[PDB]
Amino acid sequence: KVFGRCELAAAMKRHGLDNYRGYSLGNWVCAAKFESNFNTQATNRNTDGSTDYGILQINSRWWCNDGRTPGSRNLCNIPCSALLSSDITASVNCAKKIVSDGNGMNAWVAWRNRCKGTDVQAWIRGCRL
Template sequence: MKALALFALLACLVPGSLSMYYGRCQLAQTLQQLGLDGYMGYSLANWVCMAAHESSYNTQATHYNSWDGSTDFGIFQINSRYWCQNGDEYSSNICQIPCSDLLSNNLSADVECAKIVAQDSNGMSAW
């Protein structure tokens, strides 16, 4: 019984490490607040749709790409080969961030990096 109580207490102390699944409307509101509506000519609906297909709105989604050893991170599945630094793996790290920053429930890093990806890749063609 004491172990269960201790586990429950620890679970309450680390809520930031839990994955968050945004709802469609909640994500749209957040992305609008962070300046993605109309960014590079893409509507808020475009960004929300892309997040749905890439991560199912999961802030801690990852996908390992066996063909090149890179990993996609976060709600937009931003790739470690080019856009963020994932430990010892070689990366261009164009967004100048650790990939772990893309796994936060705070989407600021995801949005700022997605803006860079969109600028450098002629829009959403990178996805």
Template sequence: MGSHRLLLQLLALLTTVTKAKVFSRCELAHILQEEGLDGYGGYSLTDWLCMAFYESTFNTAAQSIKADGSADYGIFQISSQLWCTDDRRPSDDGCRIACRDLLSSNITDDIICAKRIVRNPPGMNAWEGWAMHCKGRDLSEWVEGCDL
């Protein structure tokens, strides 16, 4: 009986650790700043916040299936076609990561992969949400009141 309870506690702990999260704007701003994204690849912290909002509304569990059968995962909606592997179809796996790992509340791996993506020639244009809603705009409102 004791080992059964221990297993249940372990499963509960694992579920808690990998649970998805919807970040507040300022909470995410602080994390992205701590992770060195302000200025990374020539893009400001506000670019990264605006992109994450239009890609996932700051939800780490966001997933969207594309017409070609690929899918986008996590807070930055990272593509399974190019950057991560899932069970749907073959991938270039540019970030060497399982797509499901991009869905947890720990976004360190998402950030590492996003840095790799932005180093490529399209830069942030790789994200349609950023290109349509953030590019070339005054984004100062994204960090207002965040105490950065």
């Protein structure tokens, strides 16, 4: 599923991400835009052989099991394919674990390089929340 901007904001709002660990909703919408262009089915292979999955591009080296990242962890205790669903629940629940692990949203390279320190509130402007 390719979400619309305000549609995603509302779904993320409905799943507890607004101000989760102090990150306002616009931060999460901005991160999803530049990580996956709002597409739940996005995948990308990394040099080390791990793969990033879903709307927030969660990596198989630590967070999910895809059966082909030897020596990896599965800290969210899920198959990586669950992160490609049109239901974003699994992605949101895993993202909450990631952002709590000490490094905040710096775990998302696109957030660090394209959202951090910008007017992120613009990503939810005009939406009805």
